């Protein structure tokens, strides 16, 4: 239900949302249509849910990291920038944002992490991670702490995980292998083992988050931290003489941060697509438009080539994308979304000490082959059950076995019940996309009884197929898209332990 005639933007909290508001005010002054900028909590997860229902902002700002999933699901609308504009941005930024050969969002700026130390406490930063303990101990004598950064978000801890080895998705002959995940190989093991050793050496605390570390460094408590461009403004106002440098080398190898590209995508459900285009091309991605949001909160290395000269007077940008030059651009494949969640859990699980390092990495790597497997299985079945014609696109062997077994068992239980499913669909009063969005509540209540079984989830998938059929009858059709995803999340969010325990979908097919 996006209103027509007014522009609504979503930008993460730790961004120059005041600068975005300023450019929006400029837009309103010129074009004469109201502009509103919001920073919803974890907007990267809010946007898909709301846009799936047809509501949401007319523009969504985020790293290219996950925009590929947005475009693949259809939430984003393909942009059509003239060749002249396509020349106005760095080619690698375009290649990063481009998905399936088509441009799905406008890159705003390329950013990567850096090691920011306090010159006052630490005259020279440690050139390698192995020196952190020593310095820590030294600074522990004077009551300070050497390094303190955000351990909650896997983005900040990843550069260390990827230093020695470790990779997200193995590239091969021009395409990824989503069945090949590098978050369980030796390099990631060593990196996260060093991190947990730092944690249990008292040099770090697990509960540290972004705000805690930022405040600590601003007050001058901690000598070093790890952060990206957006943080610098907070450092600047605290009057703590600071330097920013390449991340320490680990085991003789550089730490490779996942280079991100903050980019703006236009909502598919938005009737005001051209309005968003005017806001981005003509208004946002200009020298002054980007300069304002940078002065508010430095984005990092801007995508615009013209502004890069002004981007050069500041050594911090040089250090940041030096770290980037050590690192690689985040892939836009949709799996990446789930992947991040995966690593997130492991990062916490080992950091708190709940799970052993190798245990956490193995869990995070099974999350990559559990999430996408389940999403694919639900796909091509829910749509097949609704339309009635099996989709002929290729699956692997486990995928085909799961498809067949799900078909037979789910159709059988649908036939057996019939009246119960019909009455419950009536009792839910599913008429619009918001109803299927709220279907998450029954999703959680289904498993809330405290016991688990394959029968429960298979009956759930059958009910989902029935709901998709009736959505086709009531012509929602598009509601087939998120409902399937709605299942996947609750399967990976609340049932990951059982799914991994039962060998994933292999145990599912064996039990049926």
């Amino acid at each position: 239900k996006i209103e027509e005639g007014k522009l609504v933007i979503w930008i993460n909290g730790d961004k120059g949302y005041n600068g975005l508001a300023e450019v929006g005010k400029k837009f309103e002054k010129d074009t004469g249509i109201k502009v509103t900028v919001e920073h919803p909590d974890k907007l990267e997860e809010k946007f898909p849910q709301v846009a799936a229902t047809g509501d949401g902002p007319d523009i969504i700002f985020w790293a290219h990291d996950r925009f590929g999933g947005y475009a693949q699901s259809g939430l984003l609308a393909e942009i059509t920038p003239d060749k002249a504009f396509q020349d106005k941005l760095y080619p690698f930024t375009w290649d990063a944002v481009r998905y399936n050969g088509k441009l799905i969002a406008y890159p705003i700026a390329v950013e990567a992490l850096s090691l920011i130390y306090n010159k006052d406490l630490l005259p020279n930063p440690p050139k390698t991670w192995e020196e952190i303990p020593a310095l820590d101990k030294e600074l522990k004598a004077k009551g300070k702490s050497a390094l303190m950064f955000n351990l909650q978000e896997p983005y900040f801890t990843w550069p260390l995980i990827a230093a020695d080895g470790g990779y997200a998705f193995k590239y091969e002959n021009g395409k990824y292998d989503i069945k090949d995940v590098g978050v369980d190989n030796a390099g990631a093991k060593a990196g996260l083992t060093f991190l947990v050793d730092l944690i249990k050496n008292k040099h770090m605390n697990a509960d540290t988050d972004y705000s805690i570390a930022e405040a600590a460094f601003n007050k001058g408590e901690t000598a070093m931290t790890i952060n990206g461009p957006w943080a610098w403004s907070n450092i600047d106002t605290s009057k703590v003489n600071y330097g920013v440098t390449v991340l320490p080398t680990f085991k003789g190898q550089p730490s490779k941060p996942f280079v991100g590209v903050l980019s703006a995508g236009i909502n598919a459900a938005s009737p005001n697509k051209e309005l968003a285009k005017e806001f981005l091309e003509n208004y946002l991605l200009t020298d002054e438009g980007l300069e304002a949001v940078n002065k508010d909160k430095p984005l990092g290395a801007v995508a615009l080539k013209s502004y890069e000269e002004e981007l050069a007077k500041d050594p911090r940008i040089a250090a940041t994308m030096e770290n980037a030059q050590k690192g690689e651009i985040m892939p836009n494949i949709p799996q990446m979304s789930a992947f991040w969640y995966a690593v997130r859990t492991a990062v916490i699980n080992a950091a708190s000490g709940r799970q052993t390092v190798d245990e956490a990495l193995k869990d995070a790597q099974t999350i990559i082959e559990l999430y996408r497997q389940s999403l694919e299985i639900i796909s091509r079945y829910l749509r097949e059950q609704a339309t009635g014609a099996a989709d002929t696109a290729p699956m692997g062997a486990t995928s085909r076995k799961a498809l067949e077994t799900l078909r037979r068992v789910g159709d059988g239980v649908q036939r057996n019940h019939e009246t119960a499913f019909q009455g419950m669909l009536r009792k839910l009063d599913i008429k619009n996309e918001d109803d299927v969005k709220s279907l998450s509540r029954v999703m959680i209540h289904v498993f809330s009884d405290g016991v688990t079984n394959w029968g429960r989830i298979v009956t759930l998938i059958s009910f989902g197929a029935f709901v998709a059929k009736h959505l086709k009858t009531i012509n929602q059709e598009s509601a087939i898209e998120p409902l399937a995803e709605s299942i996947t999340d609750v399967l990976v969010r609340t049932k990951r332990d059982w799914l991994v325990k039962q060998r994933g979908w292999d145990g599912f097919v064996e039990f049926f």
Partner: antibody
Framework: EVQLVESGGGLVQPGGSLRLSCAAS????????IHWVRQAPGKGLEWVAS????????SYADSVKGRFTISADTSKNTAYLQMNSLRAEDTAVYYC????????????????????WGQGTLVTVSS | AQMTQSPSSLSASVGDRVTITCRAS??????VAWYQQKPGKAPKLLIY???SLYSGVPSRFSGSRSGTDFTLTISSLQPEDFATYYC??????????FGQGTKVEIKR
């Protein structure tokens, strides 16, 4: 291993036209970035043209902008530098060099050094 | 994108430092590499990324960095090292810029 040899370097006239064909062996041509560099006699290395994107985007130096056209042939694995309106100062030893990083997604970054070079094929442009 | 090499040509004997500097002008990409060219041969890639050395090269070469400068250093010069040394930058845009190159020659 990786051996890339380019031929076609001969004698042409001012304002002439010629094409240099770089065959490669040991690696797929289309799976890596290809740069045609040229070194004039008694001069430093000079970069001429580049295929750098996974989607075939091409870039050229100002002196060879448009005038030179870089292309690939995945079937024959033979890159081509098709020249036109060749001038005398274009004479040099032309090296077809490769660049490839094991960690390269659909977007090819970071840019690494020219790992491999061909034997060079002197092209003389005179009347 | 301009890269300035220095010195034009230095004189060295076996076992010295004789570092070589390269300055990037109005460009802040850190993707810089150093190649070695012997007379009448294809240049060899010594180091890339402005810090990492190409595998198969002896450790005597080091790609130190000084912010806007990138320096190549030889811990102990050897007879084989006497050749020309080029530094090039692959800007974050689509471009490649090679330095003027500097020559290393025997000190007698």
């Amino acid at each position: 291993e990786v051996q890339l040899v380019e031929s076609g370097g001969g004698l042409v006239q001012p304002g002439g036209s010629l094409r240099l064909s770089c065959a490669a062996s040991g690696f797929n041509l289309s799976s890596s970035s290809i740069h045609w560099v040229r070194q004039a006699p008694g001069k430093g290395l000079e970069w001429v043209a580049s295929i750098y994107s996974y989607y075939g985007s091409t870039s050229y130096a100002d002196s060879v902008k448009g005038r030179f056209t870089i292309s690939a042939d995945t079937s024959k694995n033979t890159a081509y530098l098709q020249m036109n309106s060749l001038r005398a100062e274009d004479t040099a030893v032309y090296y077809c060099a490769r660049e490839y990083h094991s960690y390269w997604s659909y977007s090819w970054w970071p840019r690494v050094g020219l790992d491999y070079w061909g034997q060079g094929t002197l092209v003389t442009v005179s009347s | 994108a301009q890269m300035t090499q220095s010195p034009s040509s230095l004189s060295a004997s076996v076992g010295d430092r004789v570092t070589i500097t390269c300055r990037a002008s109005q460009s802040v990409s850190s993707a810089v590499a150093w190649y070695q060219q012997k007379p009448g041969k294809a240049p060899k890639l010594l180091i890339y990324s402005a810090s990492s050395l190409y595998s198969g090269v002896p450790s005597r070469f080091s790609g130190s960095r000084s912010g806007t400068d990138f320096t190549l250093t030889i811990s102990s010069l050897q007879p084989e090292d006497f050749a020309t040394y080029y530094c090039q930058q692959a800007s974050l845009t689509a471009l490649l810029t090679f330095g003027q190159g500097t020559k290393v020659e025997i000190k007698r």
